Amino acid sequence: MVKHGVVMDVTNVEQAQIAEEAGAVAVMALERVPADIRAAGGVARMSDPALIEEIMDAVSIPVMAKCRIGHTTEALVLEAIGVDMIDESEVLTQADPFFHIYKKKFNVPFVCGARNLGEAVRRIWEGAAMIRTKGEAGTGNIVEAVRHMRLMNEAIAQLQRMTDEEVYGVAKFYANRYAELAKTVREGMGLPATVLENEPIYEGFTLAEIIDGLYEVLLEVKKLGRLPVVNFAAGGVATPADAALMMQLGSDGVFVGSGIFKSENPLERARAIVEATYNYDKPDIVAEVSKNLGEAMKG
């Protein structure tokens, strides 16, 4: 699993090689860049396995691929063809409106997006091995990534000031999202929209067991003062300064999709973002690589 660096979105062999040449730590194989996914519209699904394999053969760095949220068979396909990591992302069209994939039963690692601590804890409990503190992919606006990293940092800072009993109270609150389907159905059957805490609602787990599960993850967060899994910033990174900004905010690394290939000079731009990510604390370097970089993505 990647721990530092820049993960780049690529749509073909040429881009995958450009990414590696630039210094990417890994690539994200997909048929449509996020920026083009928001505009195009339609239903964005898992990419053709043949395209992903072609990319896997074209580079010597890890290859990631995304599947729709809740689409466990798309994920089983990506695992079967051997991708290094699956990204269950909101970038694509959600397949299951109630539940995310139960990632723990898979062998391949998953990276999941999260807008706040509650989402991160829930994704981690279901099996995520890496978290993507995302904002809004395809916009080229770093504010969304910043808003969420701020929300994440503040939530963790406040969690560290709580007693375990108060942390359990947070776990209990975060667990409610899992009972949404059960309550909706009960209402549809003419009964109150409530649930018993000892009835199965997700993968055989009862609300009570889910609470204990989120509680154990929150205790890890409290002890570490951060998420217990690698956490990269994503969505909106368009310039070397944006990348460096996310690192200063505590990100372990960054994901870049539209910012590179939707800009004027992809290779040069990519190298610059890679250098800024490794030297986020060196203004002179960030400044030099941003010099004469050319047009950046609109957004």
Is 158 a binding residue for a second copy by CB under 8 A? The answer is yes
Q: Cα 117 to the chain's mean position, in Å?
A: 13
Residue 231 binds what, of a second copy, Cl ion, none (CB under 5 to 8 Å, by partner type)?
Cl ion
Is 204 a binding residue for a second copy by CB under 8 A? The answer is no
Residue 74 binds what, of Cl ion, a second copy, none (CB under 5 to 8 Å, by partner type)?
a second copy
Stretch that binds a second copy, among 2-10, 19-27, 165-173, 227-235 (CB under 8 A): 165-173
Give the separation between CA 256 and CA 260, rounded to whole angstroms.
7
Is-catalytic flag, 105? no
**Do 222 and 160 form a contact (C-beta atoms < 8 A)?**
yes
Q: Say if residue 281 carries a ligand binding annotation.
A: no
Burial 89-116 (b: 16+ CB within 10 A, else e): bbbbeebeeebbbebeebebbbbbbbbe
Is 159 a binding residue for a second copy by CB under 8 A? The answer is yes
CB of 212 to a second copy, least distance (A): 11
φ and ψ at residue 228, rounded to 5 degrees: -75, 10
Residue owning tokens 């009570």: 208
Catalytic residue among 3, 66, 104, 222: 66
Stretch that binds Cl ion, among 76-84, 138-146, 196-204, 274-282 (CB under 5 A): 196-204
Give the separation between CA 32 and CA 47, rounded to whole angstroms.
9
Chain breaks in the chain (C to N over 2.5 A) after: none
Stretch that binds a second copy, among 9-17, 177-185, 222-230, 250-258 (CB under 8 A): 177-185
Residue 204 binds what, of Cl ion, a second copy, none (CB under 5 to 8 Å, by partner type)?
none
**Do 162 and 170 form a contact (C-beta atoms < 8 A)?**
yes
By CB under 8 A, name the one of 1, 81, 193, 224 that touches a second copy: 81
CB of 229 to a second copy, least distance (A): 20
Residue type, 20: E
Q: Is 194 helix (H, G, I), strand (E, B) or coil?
A: coil
Is 143 a binding residue for Cl ion by CB under 5 A? The answer is no
Q: Is 299 helix (H, G, I), strand (E, B) or coil?
A: coil
Give the strand pairing for 200-202 and 85-89: unpaired
Give the strand pairing for 26-29 and 6-10: parallel
Is 228 a binding residue for Cl ion by CB under 5 A? The answer is no
By CB under 8 A, name the one of 14, 21, 57, 166 that touches a second copy: 166
Is 107 a binding residue for a second copy by CB under 8 A? The answer is no
Annotated binding site for D-ribose 5-phosphate: 9, 138, 236, 257-258
What is the binding site for Cl ion (CB under 5 A)? 119, 122, 169, 196-197, 226-227, 231
Q: Among all residues, which ones are annotated catalytic?
A: 66
